[PDB]
Design a protein around this ligand. Structure first.
Ligand SMILES: [Fe+3]
Ligand SMILES: [Fe+3]
Ligand SMILES: [Fe+3]
Ligand SMILES: [Fe+3]
Lengths: 169, 169, 169, 169
């Protein structure tokens, strides 16, 4: 064990590692989405910049978990990162319904982790998750939900999608 | 009691108290509409900003009458504020016609209050109403009218509404 | 309907709607007190400014819950806002003890709402309540307490109240 | 008659002259009050500055009436100015109850004049009075009423009056 380790149970150390992987996976789906919308036969630069910033952001989240793992005395164990579930991501609206569901799975994974931290009476870890991750996921979800409604209104394809893309840039 | 009351009749004092309630109700209707247009399944932020400013400006008008009541010597009587007729305000065009409707009611009330003021030979109260309320009300009716015409032209729903929303923002 | 709702239970949604009403009522009580202390026969402008800011900060809290309801997926239900228990709030000290009383009621409500949030394992709702409401409420109770003690020392009426008013300004 | 005179009835010309005198008289009472409070055995510099500014202000009002008399084609007829009703003005509170009543008489005289202007269908003159004089008198009255209440609270004499005077400076 570690010299700084205090009130840090093996269960929570294990879930932070699985969470790290999950965040890297989401970062990777989003990176895949960013350059999909930069294809000449797609050409949605607003959508691309948006999923690029999302990929950055998820990768940021993984690093903060890694830093926390070290801060409490746990040990970072890095696993394989899966291929993006798709190689081609469809229409703008389809890519957004995808990210909505993906941020929801992550939200679900984070809430299960907060439950683990309560159960093990780790107030430091519950505060971490309530302040850096659960706040972030709920805002992210609401933002994409707004976007899905806005994009459906403009017409999810054709001229409306062209205009919506501009406003996302 | 009061030491400033001069040429201030009781049915004008009563009218002002009843007007303060009407203004607070309208403030709460526009507040209601404000947040309706933030629901993730409505997502019309321009409509939301326009109605939040409207809630503000109506609450201001109520405050201004409260200040007036005291300036003249009358006594403020605040009644309960009715719940808005709706929880869901429908489409952007339906909410605009609701506001147009509502502004005209407030205008009619204000014009009755102006009449009562003349009837009792209160030139101060008429001046207050003419400079502070009837001027603003007729302006605000003309604007919501312009808005309704523009929105019907842009196509009341669809891409047009998405575009008309962005100008309101 | 909503596309963002995740881990958002109905009795928390209901509590938030009932809390929004409570906040709007308190906003209207402080509004009432605000203008009471402007009557030409009361003329306590420091007390008036303190209660007008209080009306503002309570209306803000209601708005913040409204924003939260939408962020989580719940649906805002606005009820009628009761008329304040009084039209004349008595002396400066009597109005302060009224506010102290009222703030504690809101605090008790908020603490019940926090309890309901834990009961349903909503760590987001507890975090919202802890950072946004319980923190501000306990601060505001401590301030009105300090105020009440100072005003009783300065002599609750008389010259002391005239002087204590000027500090509040 | 005059080359610019249009829709200006002899009645309204006559009342503007009596009003001019009245304003000069009030200016003169206030000048008398200003230097009363500068006596070594009184020494209330706040009260003095306040009635000095009032004397200025009333004298200003008389001039604006004179200018209006010329603007419409009437002719300024200047009468004797009475001695101030008192040579010694008593306590601070007594001087303020005096000015309150004096501004009320003037308000009464102005309202009678507005009535004359309505009766003669002179919209220019009713607008003049509603915008430069009735607005001014109601504010003045409310201000002095506030002051009478504030001063009674501080204790209308002794230490409280000393402190109130400072705040008026
Ligand atoms: Fe993440
Ligand atoms: Fe209004
Ligand atoms: Fe509150
Ligand atoms: Fe005057």
């Amino acid at each position: 064990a570690s010299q700084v380790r205090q009130n840090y149970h093996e269960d929570c150390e294990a879930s932070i590692n699985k969470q790290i992987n999950m965040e890297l996976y989401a970062s990777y789906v989003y990176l895949s989405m960013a350059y999909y919308f930069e294809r000449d036969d797609v050409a949605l630069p607003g959508f691309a910049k948006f999923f690029k910033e999302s990929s950055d952001e998820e990768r940021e989240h993984a690093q903060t978990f890694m830093k926390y793992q070290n801060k409490r005395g746990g040990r970072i164990v890095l696993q394989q990162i899966a291929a993006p579930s798709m190689r081609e991501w469809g229409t703008g609206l389809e890519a957004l319904q995808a990210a909505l569901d993906l941020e929801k799975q992550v939200n679900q994974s984070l809430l299960e982790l907060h439950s683990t931290a309560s159960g093990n009476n780790d107030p430091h870890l519950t505060k971490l998750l309530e302040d850096e991750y659960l706040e972030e996921q709920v805002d992210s979800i609401k933002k994409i939900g707004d976007m899905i409604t806005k994009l459906k209104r403009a017409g999810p394809t054709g001229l409306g999608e062209y205009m919506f893309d501009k406003e996302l840039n």
